[PDB]
């Protein structure tokens, strides 16, 4: 049942900008999310001090996907364990405790990819979190689908637009509510030529070219969040990427880099079936 939103697909209602995504299949400068627009959006929250750590996503009733640097990043002396965080699902407001709406979950175990490269370019920036107890879906809580080889093959194309969401910084103030931005996938060469960092096959970049007129990008706080696409084949939402890194936010000639989820699905499957 993944990828079908209770307040949209299940009711046959389209969100305000999904048409822009489907039409391309030939957070800075984003807008406020609609209620129930991204029911898989998860907020990583720190108990003490109480603060937003990162974004993340719900892929089942017991598993959450996020970027590994959200938990482990030696350069900033970051190395969180299970007891340090709470997972907040069903949220809209960044700061408010949405009583009767959001659900706060506890973590059982965290799993960081064994070959996560924090020393150089955040290669394989991915981590899975097992919740203590299953979350109950609602109109505001529902998992996103993970891509299969065919869906990845057909959708992950330069020019095709994806959607990024998060409560991160608006400029390189934090938003009141969840922000959303739709960005085009960029040609590998262009991604390569815009930075000095060595790009690997486990990443893809997205954003508009300086001449495209439109702009937008993820920023601090958006990390771990999902980059999703809606399949024009089965009308389900799939997570193709994880907000990973950038050099600044919304800088001309620069692009955001995302973890290529499909390229890492074998690790994901392995972990999930191995550890329940």
């Amino acid at each position: 049942d993944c990828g079908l939103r209770p307040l949209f697909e299940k009711k046959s209602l389209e969100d305000k900008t999904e048409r822009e995504l489907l039409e391309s299949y030939i957070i800075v400068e984003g807008s406020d999310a609609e209620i129930g627009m991204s029911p898989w959006q998860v907020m990583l929250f720190r108990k003490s001090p109480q603060e937003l750590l990162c974004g993340a996503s719900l892929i089942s009733d017991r598993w959450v996907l996020t970027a590994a640097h959200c938990l482990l990043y030696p350069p900033w002396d970051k190395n969180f364990t299970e007891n340090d965080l709470l997972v907040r699902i069903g949220k809209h407001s960044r700061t408010r405790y949405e009583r009767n709406i959001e659900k706060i979950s506890m973590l059982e175990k965290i799993y960081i990819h064994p070959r996560y490269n924090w020393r150089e370019n955040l290669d394989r920036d991915i981590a899975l979190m097992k919740l203590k107890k299953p979350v109950a879906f609602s109109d505001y809580i529902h998992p996103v689908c993970l891509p299969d080889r065919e869906t990845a093959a057909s959708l992950l194309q330069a020019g095709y637009k994806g959607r990024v969401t998060g409560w991160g910084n608006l400029k390189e103030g934090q938003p009141s509510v969840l922000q959303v931005v739709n960005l085009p996938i960029v040609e590998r060469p262009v991604c390569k030529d815009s930075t000095r960092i060595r790009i690997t096959d486990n990443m893809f970049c997205a954003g508009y070219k300086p001449d495209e007129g439109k702009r937008g990008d993820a920023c601090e706080g958006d990390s771990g969040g999902p980059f999703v696409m809606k399949s024009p084949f089965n009308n389900r939402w799939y997570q193709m990427g994880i907000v990973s890194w950038g050099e600044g936010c919304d800088r001309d000639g620069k692009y955001g880099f995302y973890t290529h989820v499909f390229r890492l699905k074998k690790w994901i499957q392995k972990v999930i079936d191995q550890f329940g």
Partner: peptide
């Protein structure tokens, strides 16, 4: 500026 969440989750 985060609102006080229930202590029942903090434990």
């Amino acid at each position: 500026d985060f609102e006080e969440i229930p202590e029942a989750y903090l434990a």
